[PDB]
Design a protein around this motif. Structure first.
Motif, PDB file in Angstrom:
ATOM      1  N   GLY A 181      -8.312 -29.912   3.335  1.00 53.95           N
ATOM      2  CA  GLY A 181      -9.372 -30.201   4.281  1.00 53.95           C
ATOM      3  C   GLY A 181      -9.456 -29.289   5.488  1.00 53.95           C
ATOM      4  O   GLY A 181      -9.432 -29.760   6.629  1.00 53.95           O
ATOM      5  N   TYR A 182      -9.555 -27.984   5.256  1.00 56.51           N
ATOM      6  CA  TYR A 182      -9.827 -27.031   6.317  1.00 56.51           C
ATOM      7  C   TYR A 182     -11.300 -26.631   6.276  1.00 56.51           C
ATOM      8  O   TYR A 182     -12.079 -27.100   5.443  1.00 56.51           O
ATOM      9  N   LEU A 183     -11.683 -25.751   7.195  1.00 51.82           N
ATOM     10  CA  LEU A 183     -13.024 -25.183   7.239  1.00 51.82           C
ATOM     11  C   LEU A 183     -12.931 -23.711   6.866  1.00 51.82           C
ATOM     12  O   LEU A 183     -12.294 -22.927   7.577  1.00 51.82           O
ATOM     13  N   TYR A 184     -13.561 -23.341   5.754  1.00 54.05           N
ATOM     14  CA  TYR A 184     -13.427 -22.001   5.205  1.00 54.05           C
ATOM     15  C   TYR A 184     -14.785 -21.493   4.744  1.00 54.05           C
ATOM     16  O   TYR A 184     -15.732 -22.260   4.559  1.00 54.05           O
ATOM     17  N   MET A 185     -14.861 -20.176   4.560  1.00 50.41           N
ATOM     18  CA  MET A 185     -16.027 -19.517   3.993  1.00 50.41           C
ATOM     19  C   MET A 185     -15.552 -18.402   3.075  1.00 50.41           C
ATOM     20  O   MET A 185     -14.652 -17.637   3.433  1.00 50.41           O
ATOM     21  N   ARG A 186     -16.157 -18.311   1.894  1.00 50.55           N
ATOM     22  CA  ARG A 186     -15.765 -17.334   0.888  1.00 50.55           C
ATOM     23  C   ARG A 186     -16.777 -16.199   0.833  1.00 50.55           C
ATOM     24  O   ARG A 186     -17.989 -16.430   0.882  1.00 50.55           O
ATOM     25  N   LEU A 187     -16.270 -14.972   0.729  1.00 49.55           N
ATOM     26  CA  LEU A 187     -17.099 -13.784   0.576  1.00 49.55           C
ATOM     27  C   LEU A 187     -16.538 -12.952  -0.567  1.00 49.55           C
ATOM     28  O   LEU A 187     -15.402 -12.474  -0.489  1.00 49.55           O
ATOM     29  N   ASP A 188     -17.331 -12.779  -1.620  1.00 50.12           N
ATOM     30  CA  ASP A 188     -16.895 -12.045  -2.800  1.00 50.12           C
ATOM     31  C   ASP A 188     -18.126 -11.481  -3.501  1.00 50.12           C
ATOM     32  O   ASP A 188     -19.241 -11.532  -2.973  1.00 50.12           O
ATOM     33  N   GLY A 189     -17.918 -10.938  -4.700  1.00 56.41           N
ATOM     34  CA  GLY A 189     -19.000 -10.335  -5.458  1.00 56.41           C
ATOM     35  C   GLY A 189     -20.005 -11.318  -6.023  1.00 56.41           C
ATOM     36  O   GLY A 189     -21.036 -10.884  -6.548  1.00 56.41           O
ATOM     37  N   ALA A 190     -19.736 -12.618  -5.930  1.00 59.56           N
ATOM     38  CA  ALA A 190     -20.629 -13.637  -6.462  1.00 59.56           C
ATOM     39  C   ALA A 190     -21.630 -14.151  -5.437  1.00 59.56           C
ATOM     40  O   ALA A 190     -22.465 -14.995  -5.780  1.00 59.56           O
TER      41      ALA A 190
END
Length: 49
Positions: free
Chosen positions: A16-25
């Motif tokens: 339960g953290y706050l995250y953001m993903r950045l990738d090729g998708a």
DNA sequence: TGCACAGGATGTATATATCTGACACGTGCCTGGAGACTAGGGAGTAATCCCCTTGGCGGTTAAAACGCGGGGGACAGCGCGTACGTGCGTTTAAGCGGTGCTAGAGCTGTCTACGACCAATTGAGCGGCCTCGGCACCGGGATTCTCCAGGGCG
């Protein structure tokens, strides 16, 4: 490899953290926004790339 | 007078001798069966090289996949009438038996053009190459072309 990214999202989601993903998708419009959102002061602890 | 009968005068399937058609058997001349010589065409191998794969990560794009509105077109129901279906009598003409022919179909010598088979030259046609002018793709702009909202008109 990108197969670690989804498992890491299920983990960070388990704890339960706050995250953001950045990738090729992702798209080009959600990239700069997810960038400035992290650079500015916010509650996001971890940023996945 | 009204009636039954004994025999002739015609039919009629019945049984017998007779007429095509097709299966069955006994030949001999163009076929096959087979024996030997030649030889080039087929079975077998030694590199080879050459394009064709091996295995799978990611990043991104263009194409594939799904989802809903509804508009118009597929489609069921139903009445009409004239266009063939069905049934008669009347005609023209093919089927068929039989005939007199011929002119073209059909099997057989002659030789003679004339094309099959084989050396010698080469040149016109094939492998290799390296360019540029026609071609590929797209902007600029004009042009047409369809879609939708009154409104003047029912």
């Amino acid at each position: 490899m990108t197969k670690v990214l989804d498992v890491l999202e299920q983990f960070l989601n388990y704890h339960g953290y706050l995250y953001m993903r950045l990738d090729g998708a992702t798209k080009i419009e959600d990239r700069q926004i997810l960038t400035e959102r992290f650079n500015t002061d916010s509650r996001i602890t971890v940023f996945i790339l």
